[PDB]
Symmetry: D2
Subunit: 236 residues, 4 copies
Amino acid sequence: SDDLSFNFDKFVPNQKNIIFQGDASVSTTGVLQVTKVSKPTTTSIGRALYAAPIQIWDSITGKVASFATSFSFVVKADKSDGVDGLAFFLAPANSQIPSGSSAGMFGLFSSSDSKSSNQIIAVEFDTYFGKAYNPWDPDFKHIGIDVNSIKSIKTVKWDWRNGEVADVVITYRAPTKSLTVCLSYPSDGTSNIITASVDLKAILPEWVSVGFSGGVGNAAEFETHDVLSWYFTSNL
Amino acid sequence: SDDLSFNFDKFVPNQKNIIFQGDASVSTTGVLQVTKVSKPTTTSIGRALYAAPIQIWDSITGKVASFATSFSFVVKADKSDGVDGLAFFLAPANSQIPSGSSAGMFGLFSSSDSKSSNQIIAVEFDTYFGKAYNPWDPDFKHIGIDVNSIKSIKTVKWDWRNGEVADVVITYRAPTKSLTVCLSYPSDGTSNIITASVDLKAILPEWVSVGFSGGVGNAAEFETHDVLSWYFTSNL
Amino acid sequence: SDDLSFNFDKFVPNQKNIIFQGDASVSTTGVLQVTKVSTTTSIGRALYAAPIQIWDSITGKVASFATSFSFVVKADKSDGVDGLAFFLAPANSQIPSGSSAGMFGLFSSSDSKSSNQIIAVEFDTYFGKAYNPWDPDFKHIGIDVNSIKSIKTVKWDWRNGEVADVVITYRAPTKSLTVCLSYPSDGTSNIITASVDLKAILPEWVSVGFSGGVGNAAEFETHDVLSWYFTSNL
Amino acid sequence: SDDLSFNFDKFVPNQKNIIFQGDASVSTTGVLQVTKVSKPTTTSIGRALYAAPIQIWDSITGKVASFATSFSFVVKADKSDGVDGLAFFLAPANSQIPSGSSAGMFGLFSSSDSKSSNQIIAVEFDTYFGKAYNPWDPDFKHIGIDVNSIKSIKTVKWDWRNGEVADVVITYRAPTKSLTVCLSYPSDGTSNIITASVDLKAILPEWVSVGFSGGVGNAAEFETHDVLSWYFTSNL
Ligand SMILES: *[C@@H]1O[C@H](CO)[C@@H](O)[C@H](O)[C@H]1NC(C)=O
Ligand SMILES: *[C@@H]1O[C@H](CO)[C@@H](O)[C@H](O)[C@H]1NC(C)=O
Ligand SMILES: *[C@@H]1O[C@H](CO)[C@@H](O)[C@H](O)[C@H]1NC(C)=O
Ligand SMILES: *[C@@H]1O[C@H](CO)[C@@H](O)[C@H](O)[C@H]1NC(C)=O
Ligand SMILES: OC[C@H]1O[C@@H](O)[C@H](O)[C@@H](O)[C@H]1O
Ligand SMILES: OC[C@H]1O[C@@H](O)[C@H](O)[C@@H](O)[C@H]1O
Ligand SMILES: [Ca+2]
Ligand SMILES: [Ca+2]
Ligand SMILES: [Ca+2]
Ligand SMILES: [Ca+2]
Ligand SMILES: [Mn+2]
Ligand SMILES: [Mn+2]
Ligand SMILES: [Mn+2]
Ligand SMILES: [Mn+2]
């Protein structure tokens, strides 16, 4: 069969095969709250990674892995708007939250440069785009393919629905270097899609960690970043 | 594991686990040509089904199946336009091409009515929309979710690329009755998506056959309908 | 992923993805009764509705496969006939004309004809020398290749009415076919392994399934398979 | 699909999703040498675990997991005999080699008692059975199901073949609490089998680590303990 394949229909408190970084944790109702949700709403940053590294490419054979992932998340804001967003990403094996990272960078970047050493590929679901604080963002809530920088190489308008469950399917096909993001809201049939070319071998190291990250830059514009389930499979 | 799961990376001439109806066949280059391609072009209709029925729902337990399928196809037209389109469908087990069917109906319908007895769910990739002959179609090449009728319940503009390979992922999630179509062109990043609500239990019988169908209504406006690979999985 | 993979936790009456041959059918309790239960002589086979490509003539590749199933053989007296078998045969093959229960509806004779193109793992309950001269002197598990006279057998510690779990694996690279049987009830286990070159015996496209028979109504027993998992890959 | 499923056709030097304990490592030829192989030969103990914990049972729902694993190993001895053996095991998440463990205990036990706190289930392929040093062992090379003690609850004669590759399939079926070990030698058709009843919920904690361990108690009677490939899948 395939190299790796795991599925979580729900999460359990202190799940031992998920590494929790920052304020990420799983509530008693079985949902992964990557971003903290509490009594007085507070600023927050969190990441959750699957406990075992994944070989995304082989230097011996030259082979690159194809992978697919599916997850459902909810972003519920108190007012009609919230910050900062959520992201699915691939980073160097067992990487830590960069020193001096902000919610607007989802705990993935130290700065707004496009440093080659970052070695990060992420699909962001950006809810905040204020030019004052996030000058790199377009003028709307978006879905962006990030490659070594918080300034997405390609974005698309995200028709975010407050409090509604969104189903996402991301697929990467090694032979064509095609990364496709497929988002839909079963509630009303709203759908958004985006595809970009990315050479994993050129950006990432052989061994990577996969997971979710998110942040809340301003407690006044609070919103949740809850992932309900997660399926992942890769194959060299 | 899951109830069923099959994968074809390429096809073989006279593949014994695919039922060929009409002019459908697989070339020596290993591609499923649902529609006939020849020296002097001709009118054509064809369907190809996986040889074994699939239980899409259980009358005993009440359970409904969730399924996902992925395939890549190419539609290459001689001129800058072609007819008639291609479709992925679920029909009653071992059903035959309806008597008196046309290319515009992809060999799935006898008429343009919405008869409940048709028991057909299909995702069409419609290339012809002329009002003279296809009065039910919108004013552009589209992707449509068909339920018991050639007049789609929901469509979306399909940014068809002549001769380019398109990757499609269709998922049906029983719990939310959500059918999502995800199409993308690795060549230039063009992507189209559509989602609709469909209750399989209400439309289809317990046992169904899945496959592709397509047609060429006018030999003068010829185009191919080739599927390169196919992955399918269902689970009750 | 793999070329094919299916799983049946239980069966349904008139399951449309199983081809029923002979007296095979599935009861309302969801069990595949390959052999008729009511009393009478019987022969039956059940195949998965779609052919499977076991090897490619273009590339030369051979498929590795694994299957798991649980069956029960309940006899009225302390003994029964005739046995059950899991097999691979030419695509959509029919029960051979003039076949007997002792041959499980897989063979026309007791010869080793190359044209039979059949590989089967039998769970033989009858071994009387008068009628089954090819069989050893005990209930056995045998690897059959083009003949009812197994190329290799092993004593089968059959337990009347108990559920047996079986796992069969074929690893193409080493041409190794292994049968793993166990009884969760009391821990009884039997195992057997043999070398078989599928490419040499079978055609490219085959049908897989179960077959069984009851040669004498007086020594009745059931041949019920409760579940079935199968997966192959080229 | 299933909760977890991974497959290694070969191993890579310093594989990042395998935790190496003791002298375990993977050679350049891609084989997991759980026990050290060098010239001059030396006493050795080693363990290799999959990097991520696995939930073997849920305290909330009461559910127990069914799992299956397949691997191929080779035990090549210099003389006509070797020590000490190899083992596949399930232990508490991220457990370490017990302080004061010996090769005869495969780096799994501190003593020869049957302490309930050990929380270990292992299938051993014991090559040494000398009564002087291993008084608990039967009078032949064996396969044993160990539950919280090096004194197996059930054994069977193991017809070990020097230097030959052995294929093993272990399955645990939660509903019947049945653990079955299926070993065979493709080389000559030699096969050994053993089955026992084990209630995982009663022995192990919810989260466990799975892997291989082995030892060489006496450098004079050296032998290798190499696993060539490993497939594992579990499901709650
Ligand atoms: C950004 O993060 C990296 C990695 O932790 C660190 O080396 C670098 O110093 C950080 N930048 C700043 C200004 O701290
Ligand atoms: C449409 O197809 C159905 C099924 O083959 C058939 O019964 C019906 O008569 C057809 N309509 C016409 C006009 O033939
Ligand atoms: C044995 O079965 C084959 C296949 O049906 C048939 O051709 C042959 O004639 C049978 N033998 C006899 C004696 O009928
Ligand atoms: C046996 O191992 C356990 C766990 O490391 C340890 O607590 C115990 O002290 C060990 N026994 C001895 C004699 O060291
Ligand atoms: O007595 C038992 C035997 O009865 C015969 O009629 C039959 O051909 C044999 O296969 C076996 O069933
Ligand atoms: O001769 C082999 C034996 O050597 C002993 O020193 C050791 O305690 C035993 O476990 C075994 O390794
Ligand atoms: Ca932002
Ligand atoms: Ca049309
Ligand atoms: Ca017999
Ligand atoms: Ca020992
Ligand atoms: Mn952004
Ligand atoms: Mn249309
Ligand atoms: Mn026999
Ligand atoms: Mn022992």
